[PDB]
C-alpha cells in the first residue's frame, strides 16, 4: 500500500491552555503593562467576590453557575483560543497570589473562591476535556476480579447515587451502567467527606470510589497545591517589596476582602 514520508512564551501558554484549565503550574515570562496588571487582577477579583458573596448567601452550584457564567465573556473568558484571554486568566491568578498570600484569612478566602471557580470551569468542560486534563496532571483502578468479588457491596453503595445523580431510575439501566463503570481504591482518609455521607464503600481502611464521582479529589488537590504555593509566595514577599509601583495596587485589591 502507498505512503508519503517571544515565540516560546506563546507556545507555553498554548500548552498551558490545551487542557482548557490549569493548576497554574509554572512561572510566567516576558512582559505585560502595569495597567494590564491592575485591570486583570480586578477582573478576576470581581468574579471571586461574587462567588464568595453567593456562597455566603448559601446558593447552590447551579445558581452560582447561572450567576457567574455570563461574567466570563466580560471579565475572564474561558473555553477560548485567544492568547490575550489565556494570558489574562493566567496572570490575574498569579497577581492575586501576591495579593492574598499575605495572611491566613486572605489565603483561605482566595483558596476557597479560586477552588470553587475551578469547580465551575471543570463542570463547563466536555468529558473528553476532563479526561485529558486529569491525565495531564499525572493523576489506582481496581481489577475486574476485585470488582466482581465486591460487586454486591459496590452496587449497594452506588445504586441510590446512580438514581439521584445520573437520573437512572430504572434498575435495568443502573445495572447496565454499573457493568460499564470503573472504581478507584484509595485510603479512606483521602475522601473523608464522601465517607461521612456514606457515599463510598469502605473495606480494610480503603475507600472504593466510582469513576463518575471523585471530582472533590481534583479540586482538593488544586486547593492544597494553591495553599502551598501561597505559603511559598508569602515567604518571598520581601522580593516583591523592590518595586513600589505594585504595592498600592495590591493594597487596593486586598482592601475589598478586609
Amino acid at each position: 500500500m502507498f505512503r508519503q514520508s517571544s515565540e516560546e512564551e506563546k507556545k507555553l501558554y498554548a500548552r498551558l491552555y490545551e487542557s482548557k484549565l490549569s493548576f497554574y503550574d509554572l512561572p510566567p515570562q516576558g512582559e505585560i503593562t502595569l495597567e494590564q496588571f491592575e485591570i486583570w487582577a480586578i477582573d478576576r477579583l470581581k468574579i471571586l467576590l461574587e462567588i464568595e458573596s453567593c456562597l455566603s448567601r448559601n446558593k447552590s452550584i447551579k445558581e452560582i453557575e447561572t450567576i457567574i457564567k455570563p461574567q466570563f465573556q466580560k471579565l475572564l473568558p474561558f473555553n477560548t483560543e485567544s492568547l490575550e484571554d489565556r494570558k489574562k486568566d493566567y496572570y490575574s491568578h498569579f497577581i492575586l497570589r501576591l495579593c492574598f498570600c499575605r495572611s491566613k484569612e486572605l489565603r483561605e478566602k482566595f483558596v476557597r473562591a479560586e477552588t470553587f471557580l475551578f469547580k465551575i470551569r471543570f463542570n463547563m468542560l466536555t468529558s473528553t476535556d476532563q479526561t485529558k486534563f486529569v491525565q495531564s496532571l499525572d493523576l489506582q483502578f481496581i481489577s475486574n476480579e476485585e470488582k466482581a468479588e465486591l460487586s454486591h457491596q459496590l452496587y449497594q453503595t452506588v445504586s441510590a447515587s446512580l438514581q439521584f445523580q445520573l437520573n437512572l431510575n430504572e434498575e435495568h439501566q443502573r445495572k447496565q451502567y454499573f457493568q460499564q463503570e470503573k472504581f478507584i481504591k484509595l485510603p479512606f482518609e483521602n475522601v473523608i467527606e464522601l465517607v461521612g455521607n456514606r457515599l463510598v464503600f469502605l473495606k480494610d481502611g480503603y475507600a472504593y470510589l466510582p469513576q463518575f464521582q471523585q471530582l472533590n479529589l481534583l479540586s482538593n488537590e488544586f486547593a492544597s497545591k494553591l495553599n502551598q504555593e501561597l505559603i511559598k509566595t508569602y515567604q518571598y514577599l520581601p522580593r516583591l517589596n523592590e518595586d513600589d509601583r505594585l504595592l498600592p495596587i495590591l493594597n487596593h485589591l486586598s482592601s475589598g476582602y478586609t
Partner: protein, 198 residues
Amino acid sequence: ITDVERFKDTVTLELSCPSCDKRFPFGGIVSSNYYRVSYNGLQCKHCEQLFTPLQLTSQIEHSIRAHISLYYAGWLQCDDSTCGIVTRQVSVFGKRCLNDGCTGVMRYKYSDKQLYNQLLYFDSLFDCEKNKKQELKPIYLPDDLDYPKEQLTESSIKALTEQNRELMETGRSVVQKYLNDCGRRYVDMTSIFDFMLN
C-alpha cells in the same frame, strides 16, 4: 483615578496658529473661545485658519521632545525644606545632598512620573473614546474669564469625534511612539520569578 486628578500637575498643551501666531490651550474636542473643531479638522477662531494634520502633529511632537529634553536636563532638588538647593550636580551617592551639613535627600525636580503623566495627558487629548465621554482634563473652569459661552452638545461631540477620527488617531500615534520607549511602562515576569530560581 480620573484624568482630572491624574493630570493635575501636567502642563497644558499649547498650540500656535500657523497663520496668525496666536497661541491657545488645546483640550481636545471641546468648546473653546480660541479654536473650533469642525468636520474638516482643527480651526483657529481668530483667523479661521484650518490646521493641516502635519501642522498639528509636529507641534505635539515638539512639545513631547521639549518635555523629554527638560527631563534629561537633570535638575535635582533637595527635599529638606530648609535647604531646598536646586542643582544639576550629582554626587557619587546620588541621593546625598551636596550642601554641607544637610541630610536631605536629592530628587529629580522633573521626575519620570511627571514626564510619564505628561505624555499620558497628551495621549488622552487625542483619545476618541475619552473625547466622546468628555473625560478629559478641563482647560477652562466655569469661573474662568475665558470660559466658552456656547457649549457643544454631547451629540455634536460624538459626531465631531467620529468625523475627525483619522486626525485624532494620527496625533495619538505620535504620542504612542514615545510612550512605547518610556521605561516607566512594562513588568518583566521572567526576572520576577526568581523564587522558582531558588
